[PDB]
Design a protein around this ligand. Sequence first.
Ligand code: TUV
Lengths: 251, 11
Amino acid sequence: GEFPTLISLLEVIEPEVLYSGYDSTLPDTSTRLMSTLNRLGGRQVVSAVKWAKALPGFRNLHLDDQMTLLQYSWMSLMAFSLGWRSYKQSNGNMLCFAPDLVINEERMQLPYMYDQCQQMLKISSEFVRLQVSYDEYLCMKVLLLLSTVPKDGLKSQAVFDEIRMTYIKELGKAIVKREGNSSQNWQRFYQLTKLLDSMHEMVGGLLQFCFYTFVNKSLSVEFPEMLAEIISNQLPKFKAGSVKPLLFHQK
Amino acid sequence: RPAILYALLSS
Ligand SMILES: C[C@@H]1C[C@@H]2[C@@H]3CCC4=CC(=O)C=C[C@]4(C)C3=CC[C@]2(C)[C@@]1(O)C(=O)CO
């Protein structure tokens, strides 16, 4: 109903922004920067689990489906959230990983940092180009949680299909709020669902580098236990080609 | 399989 509205629930369950504790007294190194970012990321993923448990409908899914969706989508959630923070703090000019850890053009020059930061900046630049509202962002972020699935389907497929329909309608409500006409509303829905589809390609490159760093420990970068457990499960499924994106537009 | 994740989701 409207007391409370679903969108007000999404606003109140959004986690607070975490700080990194990064020590910038001495110069950066790619190893200590990436290890700091992985540790922050593990803490952000724990917050994302608490968020997902609070999402209306999510706990109607089989527990194994809840585990699968979070394991498959965590990088999309974290990159999208990073895009929003970077949009609000710097209009997408810098990557705001935490309020005490902002990556500018010079830190991107570190070894192995440039290509991954370029992909993350592209996400932030889309929020700028489309002038995404907070409520559009919140609805789109739920849909990312529901956008990467096993090819063999989920245990609670019918529940999942209904959850996805509910939050697609909620994104529509957030669009209509901007007070455009019906034709403008459909065009904006097209633009935002195209952005959602593009996240699979933009995040796929981030995952491949993450997987590479996890497996080969290039420069011996550390991962927290939370990410190491998820990555250890996610990588074989992705490598076997057993995962598929759910797309709004035919590819 | 992932212990921390399962412990969190089990409440
Ligand atoms: C190439 C990847 C991108 C990964 C991500 C990108 C998204 C994100 C947003 C945050 O604000 C905090 C942490 C993460 C989750 C982050 C940290 C480092 C990464 C895992 C990575 O740099 C490594 O693999 C290094 O080892």
